[PDB]
Symmetry: D2
Subunit: 116 residues, 4 copies
């Protein structure tokens, strides 16, 4: 899996389960083309989004629906979502983990990029 | 100052100076309408973006040009930019500080929301 | 103010008010000698800890009583406290802001170091 | 493994490899007794620190030698180390992942605590 998304809850100290994630790729006309989507598992991880052959060079956007996560816990959070936009595979194929750490009024995101 | 943006550099341990930030309000057609912009000061701060009168309820986006910042420092960055999207003033007017802490492969954002 | 500590609450999106902070300097015997202390203000800030004269080179520790803060809010915390240990003034006197962003199961700390 | 430590580098977007970690447990006399140590693998993970039977209730300290990590990369970082202090197993045995995300002038730490 060349693209994985992991989401953690900094209030409970747990994986953030059942969080929707949507991936888009910038098209030649500069629009955001839907690329993949899913929801986080019990481990907070969203696997199986793409394959090495489909995950070509390009600019990708990962949008994590953090607002729905907090709202289901009774909380009205600050952010509408957490979005991560990045160029992928510019130097050849890589494996990307996009990790997000969520609090109601703050989030952090990191990328772990490895060479297979 | 109903809206302030502060940007910090976690590599140098300093304010992130001369970082462009652009503010948008979501339009009725779901498009992003540009609202205000500026460059961070020597303290990392972007002041004077809006006024109490103009900063009505709505969904707002702050886009921080983190890629140009890292490029100017000669450091390879992961993200194309950092975006913060939030609903403003849903329970009355508030003063918002959006703080962003930047590293080349990670960023975090927090909101400090105080009632005047 | 050679040394300032600022504490923010990522759950409420506010300064963390009335948080105790204690500052220590490492002694020749490697023990921690208490140096200064205070409680964060309504802006989350602990000012007036030390002076230019007293804040000589050395290794310093700031201990933030995060557990008492979360307990006062009725929220279960993970950490006993948050500690920040750093060598100060190794290349001349600097002004240090130690910023801590608190969640119940996570914290982050950053230093903003500026040369007067 | 009831206790795992994971360390990531936010500058390079990579696991932080070969980082020393030391674990201590608070003794009945209030001293810090050495409990386990190791170094992070190529995945940034330190496994095999303890067993469920040995990892009894108590207050534990995990000290990560972040300064040596940065110094080996040519960087003089702000922090001397990253230390995490927490009560473990107060409600029965749990599995703890202590994750640290490192930059030269900032770090963040989170706990992911799961029930086996
Ligand atoms: C680790 C971390 C991340 C974000 C914040 C943070 O949100 C913040 C907010 C401020 O109003 C402010 O003045 C500063 N500061 O000056 O350093 C930081 C504080 C700490
Ligand atoms: C404070 C912080 C923020 C983000 C990360 C982080 O990026 C990360 C990445 C992983 O692949 C991973 O498995 C975990 N984890 O399980 O805890 C965390 C690590 C620490």
């Amino acid at each position: 899996c060349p693209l994985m998304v992991k989401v953690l809850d900094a209030v409970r100290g747990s994986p953030a389960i059942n969080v929707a994630g949507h991936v888009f790729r910038k098209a030649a006309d500069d629009t955001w083309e839907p690329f993949a989507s899913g929801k986080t598992s019990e481990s907070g991880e969203l696997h199986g989004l793409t394959t090495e052959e489909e995950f070509v060079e390009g600019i990708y956007k990962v949008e994590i629906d953090t607002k729905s996560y907090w709202k289901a816990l009774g909380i009205s959070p600050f952010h509408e979502h957490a979005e991560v936009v990045f160029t992928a595979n510019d130097s050849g194929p890589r494996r990307y983990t996009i990790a997000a750490l969520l609090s109601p009024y703050s989030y952090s995101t990191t990328a772990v990029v490895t060479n297979p």
